[PDB]
Design a protein around this ligand. Structure first.
Ligand code: FES
Ligand SMILES: [K+]
Ligand SMILES: [Mg+2]
Ligand SMILES: [Mg+2]
Ligand SMILES: [Mg+2]
Ligand SMILES: [Mg+2]
Ligand SMILES: [Mg+2]
Ligand SMILES: [Mg+2]
Ligand SMILES: [Mg+2]
Lengths: 137, 100, 91, 136, 97, 86
RNA sequence: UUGUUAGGACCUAAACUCAAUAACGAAAGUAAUUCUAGUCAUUUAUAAUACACGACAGCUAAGACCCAAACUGGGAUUAGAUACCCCACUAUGCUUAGCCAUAAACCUAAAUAAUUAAUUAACAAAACUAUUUGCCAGAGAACUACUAGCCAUAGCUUAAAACUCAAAGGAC
């Protein structure tokens, strides 16, 4: 009789629907937030591309391409393309820990899309590849 | 004349055993605002807060009931050579004792 | 005087009296504005009464103790006492 | 002129020395009193030091034979619901009455601790004391 | 000499030593229901002994069983199994809102 | 990669509060230490550097937790003066 | 090129959390999982011209190669920038054989058995006794010259003097 933060377990049967679709059917908004450019892609649950955007494609350049307001504009642009294709609910898998990590999610909301969940897929190696050397400053 | 060794063996404090979670009778001797200083027969007094219920009843000389925890609050800290003491006892005020 | 070796025998003799008065009132047990338009004597005035020199911390402590006396039930003896340390204010 | 050296000797020895030297011409008034009724220990300075290695203090833990019985009573029944009054010099607690009866039975010659503990509970029950065997 | 002098003995009132919630119990890699009580629901990361509250010996036993179960095909690595989400909470950690 | 998608590190939005859900997801990742781990994996920390940092952070946590105990312990005596005037 | 893949291949390289732990080993070093082999009794200290080891870098031959990266090239900065910052890419870090034998190889604490009081140069890591070996004798010249040994050849270990100075050095 309460809300569950935990996503509906896959393979089972749940009582939660969004526009007549189950959790496994809602399209996914893949946000890659890096320290320079924030890219956004929306796909259907069958992995078919519907919208794409990024600070670069919007027209920002160099250090402006990696700001919060630049990602917000990129999110609004991705929403508009997806909204035309017929998307109202999105599952936000946000990879990356850059400046437009949250702003890209805020732009998608401003653009008329309804986020039902937020996942994080930032790559965390379990022991992997040696990172580049520390910068001296 | 009774010896000191006998006096200690038959002392109420020796009978109490460990003072953790024991019940004792105290007497209020000093009040500062809503803080009650209660003597329960030990070396150090305890300091409790005036209960909301029957607050006016807790006046000086009033005997109360307590649940002891420590007779002296002390603790050695990292790098210390001696235990730091606050010269106070620990008890939980339960309420007035029935005069009966 | 028994408080000679304190170095402030007159300041501490007065703080002895007011602390003993406070104890008897607290043990033994109305509006406290018996006097209005009055101020506490300034440090320079207190020093003259005691015929000795005080610090700012010594003056502040004397007032806090006198305020506590007024808070408690006060017989006419206490009111006359605190009166000696009150100077009439002229508006 | 004096001996303000409080880390060598004692007040009495330093006063004895100053008079022998010739600097202190009159005995202090407390001198003859100390000479006739000295303290048990000489008041000489000593620097406190920590113990190291396997050196230990010499303090006996005070444990009477009644404590073996008292420990069982607190574990089985806790502290008596009646509150301790530590202001009455002759107070008899519920636990102290248990230990007095437990001793009486043991004087008769009972050798089993289990026998003495369950019999004592019965005797106090006859007396009317309310003993609650609180496992909680 | 004196009958009332104290008697040397071990402390009658000595309090018992506190045990961990897995004291004198068998930690098995196949018991994934118990192992899941010491990992994170979201990331599946093993909790430290400051959160779990276990002793050193059991902290190592749980750690070895989790790694063995994960590597042998009994326990998931990246998350806690959703079946075991309802089990009792034994760890001093709060995540909700 | 071989696990199931949308179970790990996933939070559900309640009543369209997309900011509240994002704030919860961050506390989960910060609490599990993923945020610090990802921060330090951008560049390489040398093994000697890693050991020096961990030994210092451990000793800083001991002295901090111990200082908290000493303040909390000595703050019990912090109350209105009972012997005002003496 | 980029993003996604609940697609395939790969098994190269490295082992998050646990680890706020302080274990194992002579030291070096060692923490993904499993199995096999395996550490153990000399009273104790005390060893080289002998034996066996010894991070990283480096050399030799055949492989590996995800990522990192001396050098090198390209781009910036600057009076210059043979650098710090950016990008690319080697030797190299990996495996298998052998060599090399050096580290601030530093707990800057030789080992062992006692003691905690009849004991503050300073700081660090409280003081101090006994036993055995090693080592030291102002600073620089000098991790140098010469000698001998060594798979080492721009190498390692061993290791002076002339000459110069009246200080050098440690703690506060
Ligand atoms: S306290 Fe006994 S095994 Fe943990
Ligand atoms: K070192
Ligand atoms: Mg260049
Ligand atoms: Mg290469
Ligand atoms: Mg060497
Ligand atoms: Mg080393
Ligand atoms: Mg060299
Ligand atoms: Mg040479
Ligand atoms: Mg040579």
């Amino acid at each position: 009789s309460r809300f569950s933060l935990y996503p509906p377990v896959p393979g089972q049967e749940s009582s939660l629907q969004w526009a007549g679709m189950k959790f496994e059917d809602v399209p996914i908004a893949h946000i890659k937030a890096t320290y320079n450019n924030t890219q956004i892609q929306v796909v259907s649950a069958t992995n078919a591309s519907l919208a794409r955007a990024s600070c670069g494609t919007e027209g920002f350049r160099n250090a402006k391409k990696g700001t919060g307001i630049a990602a917000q504009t990129a999110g609004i642009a991705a929403a508009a393309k997806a909204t035309g294709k017929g998307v109202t609910h999105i599952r936000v898998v946000v990879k990356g820990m850059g400046p437009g990590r949250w702003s890209a999610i805020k732009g998608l909301t401003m653009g008329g899309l309804e986020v039902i969940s937020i996942t994080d897929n930032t790559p965390v190696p379990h022991x992997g590849c040696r990172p580049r050397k520390a910068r001296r400053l | 004349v009774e010896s000191f060794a006998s006096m200690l063996r038959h002392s109420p404090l020796t009978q109490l055993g460990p003072a953790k979670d024991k019940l004792v009778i105290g007497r209020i001797f000093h009040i500062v605002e809503d803080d009650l200083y209660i003597d329960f027969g030990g070396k150090f007094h305890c300091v409790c807060k005036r209960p909301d219920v029957d607050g006016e009843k807790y006046q000086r000389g009033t005997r109360v009931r307590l649940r002891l925890l420590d007779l002296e609050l002390t603790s050695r800290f990292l790098g210390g050579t001696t235990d730091t003491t606050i010269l106070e006892a620990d008890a939980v005020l339960l309420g007035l004792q029935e005069i009966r | 005087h028994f408080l000679f070796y304190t170095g402030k025998q007159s300041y501490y003799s007065l703080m002895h009296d007011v602390y003993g008065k406070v104890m008897q009132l607290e043990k033994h047990r109305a509006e406290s504005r018996d006097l209005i338009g009055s101020r506490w004597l300034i440090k320079e005035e207190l020093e003259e009464m005691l015929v000795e020199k005080l610090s700012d911390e010594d003056y502040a402590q004397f007032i806090r103790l006198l305020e506590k006396l007024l808070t408690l039930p006060c017989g006419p003896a206490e009111e006359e006492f605190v009166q000696r340390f009150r100077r009439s204010v002229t508006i | 002129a004096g001996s303000r050296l409080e880390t060598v000797g004692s007040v009495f020895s330093r006063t004895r020395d100053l008079m022998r030297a010739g600097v202190l011409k009159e005995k202090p008034l407390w001198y003859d009193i100390y000479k006739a009724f000295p303290p048990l220990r000489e008041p000489v300075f000593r620097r406190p030091r920590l113990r190291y290695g396997k050196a230990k203090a010499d303090i006996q833990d005070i444990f009477y034979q009644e404590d073996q019985i008292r420990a069982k009573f607190f574990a089985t029944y806790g502290s008596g619901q009646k509150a301790f009054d530590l202001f009455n010099p002759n107070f008899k607690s519920t636990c102290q009455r248990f230990v007095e009866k437990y001793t009486e039975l043991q004087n008769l010659g009972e050798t089993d601790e289990e026998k003495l503990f369950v019999e004592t509970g019965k005797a106090l029950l006859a007396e009317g004391i309310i003993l609650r065997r609180v496992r909680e | 000499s004196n009958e009332d002098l104290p008697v040397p003995m071990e402390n009658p009132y000595k309090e018992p030593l506190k045990k961990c919630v897995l004291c004198e119990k068998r930690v098995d890699y196949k018991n994934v229901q118990l192992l899941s009580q010491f990992i994170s629901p979201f990331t599946g990361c093993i909790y430290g002994r400051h959160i779990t509250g276990l002793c050193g010996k059991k902290q190592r036993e749980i750690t070895k069983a989790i790694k063995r179960a994960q590597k042998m095909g009994f326990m998931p690595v990246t998350y806690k199994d959703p079946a075991y989400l309802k089990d009792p909470r034994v760890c001093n950690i709060r995540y909700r809102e | 990669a071989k696990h199931l998608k949308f179970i790990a590190r996933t939070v559900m939005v309640q009543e369209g509060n997309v900011e509240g859900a994002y704030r919860t997801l961050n506390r989960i990742l910060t609490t599990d230490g993923l945020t610090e781990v990802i921060s330090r994996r951008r560049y390489y920390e040398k093994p000697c550097r890693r050991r020096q940092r961990e030994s210092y952070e451990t000793c800083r946590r001991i002295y901090n937790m111990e200082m908290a105990r000493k303040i909390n312990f000595l703050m019990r005596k912090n109350r209105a003066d009972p012997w005002l005037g003496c």
